[PDB]
């Protein structure tokens, strides 16, 4: 049996780890995801795959917990994945448990960067121990914590991760980066970020208009807190606002996609 071991956790001659390089290739094949970190929230816009007219919805009762590209990890943490979808679900479940174990132990939300380290430790493991292949997945995590506010990390199959103001994973990430470079700034509203996210996404998948059918958008923003049950624990402090991960219905997203056609029409006038 050892003659047939492909030696996934070995170094190659340039200190490269081939299985991790090739997981990355697998990710650059995946549906693009854009993330834009404002100060009023974070936006994830992702390319869905082409919607065959025989696809059904799963008819889930909670519309905001998951979509095709976007998943909620906790009240305050969302992500989007590119790469081997099934690997994603393995990790996503791990990230969910981790965030809730943190909450078990401390009774407060896990910070985004710790959730992220946990996730990427789980990936790093598979690049060092165990003789199996790595997870072929890249997250964009988003969320909000009291330490750093809105955050947006991205992970790689190596287990490295990085914080960004905006970023892209998946198909034409190099191209999308270059375009966010130019148009991101530090003082964006949520609406501005939603625009930027769509202009870039529509520019990477080469469409005149944004194709509502092929796009999912999620937003992580703070909203008024409703269920302050204060007679039930009198000493507990409940913040006025709380984070919410939201996946946009086709209708909530229609305006924002029109408004990004209009800033793609008004950029082909100057030319």
């Amino acid at each position: 049996s050892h003659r047939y071991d492909s030696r996934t956790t070995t170094f190659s001659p340039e200190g490269r780890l081939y299985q991790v390089e090739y997981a990355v290739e697998a990710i650059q094949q995946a549906g693009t995801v854009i993330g834009v970190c404002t100060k009023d929230g974070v936006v994830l816009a992702g390319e869905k795959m082409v919607p065959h007219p025989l696809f059904d919805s799963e008819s889930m009762q909670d519309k905001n917990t998951s979509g095709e590209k976007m998943y909620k990890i906790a009240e305050h943490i969302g992500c989007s994945v590119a790469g081997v979808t099934s690997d994603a679900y393995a990790l996503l479940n791990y990230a969910r448990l981790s965030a809730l174990r943190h909450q078990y132990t401390f009774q407060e939300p896990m910070a985004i960067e710790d959730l992220c380290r946990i996730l990427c430790d789980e990936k790093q493991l598979y690049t060092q121990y165990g003789g199996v292949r790595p997870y072929g997945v890249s997250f964009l995590l988003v969320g909000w914590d009291r330490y750093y506010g809105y955050q947006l990390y991205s992970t790689e199959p190596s287990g490295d991760y990085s914080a960004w103001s905006a970023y892209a994973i998946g198909q034409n990430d190099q191209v999308a980066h270059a375009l966010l470079k130019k148009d991101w700034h530090e003082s964006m509203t949520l609406e501005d970020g939603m625009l930027l996210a769509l202009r870039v996404l529509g520019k990477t998948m080469d469409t005149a208009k944004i194709d509502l059918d092929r796009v999912e958008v999620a937003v992580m923003r703070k909203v008024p807190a409703s269920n302050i049950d204060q007679l039930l624990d009198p000493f507990k402090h409940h913040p006025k606002t709380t984070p919410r991960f939201q996946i946009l219905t086709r209708s909530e997203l229609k305006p924002h996609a029109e408004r990004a056609d209009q800033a793609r029409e008004a950029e082909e006038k100057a030319e």
């Binding site: 030696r7 170094f11 060092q128």
Partner: protein
């Protein structure tokens, strides 16, 4: 459990997986350590400064305990694991021995984890060198290096990552004992600029004095980069 033997001697005495881990550390960003009279200076290359990375300060020099700080070169994620282990070791140690961990003790622990991973079936080596710097609880400053073979060594100054040996050859020539805080920071900046391009947004620099660890603000650093790049013409 998977326990195949990954690291093995080849014919001419070499451990290829350890030579290749070391190759992964030559591709990593430079880092530099300098030891003065009352200061250790750790300085590292940043990757650049794309307008997209979070303008919130992310440190590339890591705190391991109150008194101890660690830079690295090589695989980021391997490093992160080593560091977490080091962090957790220093606490284990406090907790067992009340005292805080001497730097050398911490370094030896880390180097042993590195060595251990060149000899454990199932695992490849960490592809990480480290520079570690700090003060014992007796005001004596230290600076160490680990390489992926698990070998550590104390230095008066040191470099790791790309062009380590260009930088170390440089530092052999200049470096004097008993520098001041400010001469250390200078010397480190000077030494890094042997391989890094500008000194603008691609150098983080940490200054360790007994009981006080302080990163240069991007402003304080730039007075030093001009003071130094103006001394490189000559």
């Amino acid at each position: 459990s998977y326990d195949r033997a990954i690291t093995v001697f080849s014919p001419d005495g070499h451990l290829f997986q350890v030579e290749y881990a070391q190759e992964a550390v030559k591709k990593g960003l430079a880092a530099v350590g300098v030891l003065g009279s009352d200061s250790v200076v750790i300085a590292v290359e940043k990757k650049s400064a794309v307008k997209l990375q979070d303008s919130r300060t992310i440190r590339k020099i890591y705190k391991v305990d109150a008194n101890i700080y660690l830079a690295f070169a090589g695989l980021s994620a391997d490093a992160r694991v080593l560091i977490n282990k080091a962090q957790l070791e220093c606490q284990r140690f406090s907790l067992n021995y009340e005292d805080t961990m001497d730097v050398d003790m911490l370094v030896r622990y880390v180097a042993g984890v590195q060595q251990k991973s060149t000899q454990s079936g199932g695992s490849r080596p960490f592809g990480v060198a480290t520079v570690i710097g700090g003060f014992n609880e007796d005001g004596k400053p230290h600076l160490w290096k680990t390489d992926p073979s698990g070998m550590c060594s104390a230095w008066r100054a040191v470099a790791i990552g790309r062009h380590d040996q260009t930088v170390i050859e440089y530092m052999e020539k200049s470096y004097k004992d008993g520098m001041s805080r400010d001469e250390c920071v200078h010397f480190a900046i000077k030494s890094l600029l042997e391989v890094v391009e500008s000194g603008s947004r691609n150098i983080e620099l940490l200054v360790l004095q007994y009981k006080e660890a302080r990163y240069l603000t991007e402003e304080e650093l730039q007075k030093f980069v001009v003071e130094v790049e103006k001394e490189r013409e000559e």
